[PDB]
Symmetry: D4
Subunit: 242 residues, 8 copies
């Protein structure tokens, strides 16, 4: 199957927000990424508007040349913005104000009715919803039951592995989890913590549809520039698939 790359540009905004300036502008990064290998642009509108802001999402929706993937918390505030913005994709993730980044996966089991109503509301607006969960068989079953067509498997543990043996374990865990998801008719994506040195093993998973990568790309971009950083990532991914 084909492998797509979704560039998350949140960290361009984390750099802008460090100061009250307008640069660097996520709108510019979007254009560069979309013309360098990005098949879609992902932004996570946090309730504390830590990096990406409402302004960014509003403009991006009008300038993006590819489909927008809006990552957000499952709250009334975000559900409302999502419906009005009508992005092509919507990835629901867990969120906390004092968190460094998206922690574990989203709890779909012990929160079924909440996720059921969310998927339906977004679906009515014409948005394809993806659920960001761990490589957990129980979480996978829920996602498929709440009505979500997509699920994004958290790869943070995989990328955080200390030893080669622990990494192999997380990798096998993800792969299996991805295989089962597919049997349930779920389309599977992955993301979080993927770098230039560990993306290939993940891109190798046949079931994987799109990888959403942000931090590693932006981290690389400050050195070589966004174009080469994105092109580099896409190439590695295609080499792993083919």
């Amino acid at each position: 199957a084909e492998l797509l790359l979704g560039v998350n540009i949140d960290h361009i905004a984390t750099l802008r927000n460090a100061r009250g300036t307008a640069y660097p502008d996520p709108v510019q990064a979007a254009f560069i990424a979309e013309q360098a290998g990005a098949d879609g642009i992902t932004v996570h509108l946090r309730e504390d508007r830590r990096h990406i802001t409402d302004r960014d999402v509003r403009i991006l929706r009008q300038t993006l040349d590819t489909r927008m993937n809006l990552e957000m918390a499952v709250t009334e505030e975000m559900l409302a913005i999502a419906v009005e913005t009508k992005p092509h994709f919507c990835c629901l993730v867990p969120e906390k104000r004092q968190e460094v980044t998206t922690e574990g996966g989203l709890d779909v089991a012990g929160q079924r009715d909440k996720m059921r109503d969310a998927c339906k509301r977004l679906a009515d607006a014409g948005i394809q919803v993806s659920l960001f969960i761990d490589a957990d068989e129980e979480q996978i079953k829920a996602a498929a039951e709440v009505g979500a067509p997509f699920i994004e498997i958290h790869t943070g543990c995989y990328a955080d592995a200390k030893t080669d043996a622990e990494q192999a374990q997380e990798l096998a865990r993800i792969a299996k989890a991805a295989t089962f998801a597919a049997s349930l008719g779920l389309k599977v994506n992955a993301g979080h913590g993927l770098t230039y040195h560990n993306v290939k093993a993940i891109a190798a998973i046949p079931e994987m549809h799109e990888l959403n990568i942000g931090h590693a790309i932006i981290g690389r971009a400050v050195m070589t520039g966004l174009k080469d950083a994105v092109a580099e990532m896409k190439r590695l991914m295609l080499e792993a698939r083919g």
Copy 2:
């Protein structure tokens, strides 16, 4: 005695600390900068270690090919770190309403004793001290008395000007402060808020010795790569001087 460029790489660490990673590494950025037009490297070690860390300071002191400029608040902890680190340059600045003036500069005038002790503490360790203050006569005089060899004029107001008239007014303030400081035997630097579109007017000021710019350069770097970002700024500065 032309115009030098000091590149502040704090925002490299800003991007890194955003996540729990080691990249991008300020150590790599320094090499790039030093070979693209930087005549020195600036790093601000904050009390909260927001971006630059002790590790960063410790390693950079061993890898820098050019002179190091340590930006820090006037505290015993920091003075101690500076004496141990022995950076070529040290710039004293206020940290979170710790001893700051309305405009944002260090209050040297109302803290002569504390500054006298710090400048001597650092001068005796072979460090050349600069005081970050507003383009103010009173502050300039106090910097001269305290013993500081350098002063770095706060150009944030000029950089934040909302109209051409306000910008022109701030420019004139700086130009006058630069000349007054020089008549007092001080060498004058500037920076903070400088961008690719307002840097020339400051670089044209005859008294300016070195400009320490960070945010705008890192801002451009995420798009164009650090090498072109640094080379660009340096060319603008030399065009304005020559």
Copy 3:
């Protein structure tokens, strides 16, 4: 004695509008140009919206990192648009709604009343007005007489000169006129028809403040890319001022 470059991106929209597509997007070009030597971005909102659209002006006002220069004809429609848009600059030009390009030369002396009202309404919105006129003393006096702080001398005749004698005469005319406008306290810009082979002669004119160039740059850009096209133009202008 600094010489600025205003980049007119109208022809980016020309290529876009040739189809119902959204690419190439002027928003992208603006970032590229602004970081490659553009000191400002110019867009001409034609009544027929042949290239630049209302959407363009609206998004650009929000994404430009440099000042916006809004070129438009003198009509209630455009005056209202400019007032709510609050661009930094506004250049008033003659428009036929069917012309190939600005026929060059706004009749200010022949429309005193209308122009006087236009200049005041725009200035009341904090917009610095520039009148696009011919290198004619009467039209220029009329420009400063109606309030306009800026003027942009039409360089099309100079660019279209068919013989050396005709070209040198038109160059002398523009220069003579520039000096004249300056003695009136006016700020003088120039544009239309400037290319990589005739710009130097205009850049050399001491009184010139900003040159607005569009077509020649975009024409170069399709071959070499917008960044090098803009950088090339800016370098030639500065060399001429040297």
Copy 4:
């Protein structure tokens, strides 16, 4: 099974024709494209000469290093010019602006006689003919009847698809049509609204011989330069093929 790229440079003339200038010159673009991945150069000489002119065709025939594909309307004037110019390939299409012949594609089945005589007059001049038509069973059978060896499927509907579902439906219609066309002994091409984001699915169609793409490449070119724009499209195409 080889997949070829035909670069249509009409829009280069579009940018030129915005003024009475000679630049940008289609002649230059041709060389750049042929050396960056173009296997042929395509030009559409419109009755109104909207972009490509008689001068362009005449000079290109003498400067092209590859093969020229002359896209034209089935008129006496064009057929005459085609025989005069003697391009390697000829692609017959409905009028421009907003067409004359029902739909986006050419009505071969409806003007069986006109085309039949057009294909023979051209084939006798040593020119290989292609008929631009919609993905339609009847239209194809008609193309085989009139004797045209080539056909080019209108990918416009596929490119304009507003939803994924709609796009996949159009893609399947194209694939089925292409397979059916080859069964009639016809060689099949395509490419009308093809872009960097939708080209792969088309290039992946086994029967496709050459994709003729113009607008997207030119729109990308104004940003990155023609060379990279053409090389980028060619790379994506071969990736989808092999």
Copy 5:
């Protein structure tokens, strides 16, 4: 005064004529050069057409964006062609026993009547005529006598000098010759043999108006490409004149 660069593309043709193929095409070389520092293109149409052919001149006259400098022998055939092609510049060169031993500049003094008619016939066509002659008193005096507006000093002996003393002596000659020609109301050009390592001394000569360099540029181009080759030469020239 400013210094102009005239790029001779003859050796592009020599490369092509070696295989009698179509590439490399001088027409392509012209675009690249004109967009990288060339203020004009020079082509020598030999009667035997060793390199540049009739076809070359014919197309070039239609594609050049700058100005053509037709170098040719003083023959009725050549005169009739220059009058028809109507190049902006024309440089008369020797092809038979019209030379002056080594450092074979055109023999004007010995062919006063022939040159006189040539200059008058071409001038009536509005073609600026230049006489390629060696740095000789009498040859320079005859040039102004026959009415030639321009003269081009043969710097071949200077370029081939083996020792510093030899080169210095030749450089002095040229300098005296240029100054002497300027007094006679003559405009002076140079070229032939100039390289990246000896052009500055020539460009530093105040009287020099345009340098027409060819072979060194193309020889450089084969390694680094035309664009850079032309830009490098142009930069060296402007640095010298500075």
Copy 6:
């Protein structure tokens, strides 16, 4: 198995010899080529020393990092030079094309005695011999009979094919000759007239071991530079084969 690229740098010398200078130096071109895709370097030392000279062969044998392929005519002088030079390969070719040694490729069948001695003489010196011949049954068998290790099929007729039908025939005639030569235990190479647009069909023939290309690459280089030219050609070859 794999396909190799041999770059003939003869035309670098053509451009140099055009004048009496030492640039462009084939020695430089060789390094560039060997580092951009060339797996060997080829030079044809003509008896008339038209381009490549004795100096060139002498220094190249000392500077080449890859195997040297010496193309020469069958004569005592050349045989003596080859034996002394000890290139890794030696390609025998007809010279002057107006003798009883040429008919297209080398006439081995008609000079069986001369070739037998040549192959033995060169093989004894540890040189791998290649006979440049047409895709002719008689010549191919004769090459193997004479003991030559390699043969190089003359791809000229294929490169000169006027029509698509003609080129198809020639391609088939080559493909057939290749398989036939491989069955006789001979290694088959090819070259001459191959360009960036017709090289793939040849590189696709499984039997081909190494393609030796000269003119096309140098013709591209004058525009794009040698590195690019060679890398481009190698990538195309590997795409067609691997």
Copy 7:
């Protein structure tokens, strides 16, 4: 199976140590290489510290983004350093006569007890050990029984093979060895002497896990820059595995 590239930066230090300078700094080379294709960085800390020094190791352990591979002799000093440094990998090499075989690999079979102790000590510290040995069916057995999970085949003889016959003979030797090593459960690496012209045949060996290359890459870097040098080598390797 995946093929990894280990870049040995020792010769960067070779250049530095040639002078008492601090540049070129291995630390900078490591960042470059890790982002241009390196899956790991290799440094040989010699007892004499001829190039890489103790500080290089200490700093690199803290700046490397990938995995460190520490080449060292089997001594108490180095074992203590390795344990303290905790590199991901450790490759044992001969540095004295008594430790080397005639071919150049480490004499493992001759020092069973010593290597057994070494491997256990490093293994307990969490370090994966590799033994640099000859393609010998005795040293290989010794490597297994000693506990080393990895071995690195000395490809020095293969790198020196000049004739096709010698290359084939040495290659076959490495291949059989690799296959034998694998049958014993050993992981097999290679390198040493490998170049841009001989790396493919080795990379094509199925069992090869990682190639550690150094001098050839650095030698290319001085010409092209490290980034391109590393990328080129990585691309050639991956191509061999396709």
Copy 8:
């Protein structure tokens, strides 16, 4: 006022000799440097042939496009080599303990007889000799009397300066020594230990004719490639001078 750059490529050989390979080849480096800003190439033939070898000098004398500057000690072996090689320039340097001074320069004053001879012998061979001495008045006087036309001041001390005051002091010495040398009729050069960060102060010295730099450039080259390394240094030099 003209400032030249002599690139010393010894360290290219240093890297090569470390493995005994043929690469990187000094001959290639020379072409790169001469085309990137080098006005000459310097090679130090060490008696022990530590880096540059006899073959290097032999080939270089034949491939250099510019002028050779052979650095060597004063010995019958080297004198003979110099006269046989015919380098444009010869720089006499110390290599034995009894030849070096306290600072590191050549002891001309102490060996006036040995130098007087060496200078005449070389001068008769047509070689311009330079004496590498410290910034010492006594050593300078001996240089003029001995007959040497050039002298190269040892900038080593200036480069190894430990403090700002210490460095400014060394700079004054050299600047005073350069002026003094000039009053004696001695042409003056310098270069040793010069880097991208300390060359300007030296280049600014009016008397300087040519700077011979090596290690700093090759150390930069390994990171960025020789072309940019040479180009960068040349630009910095011209910037300091004009």
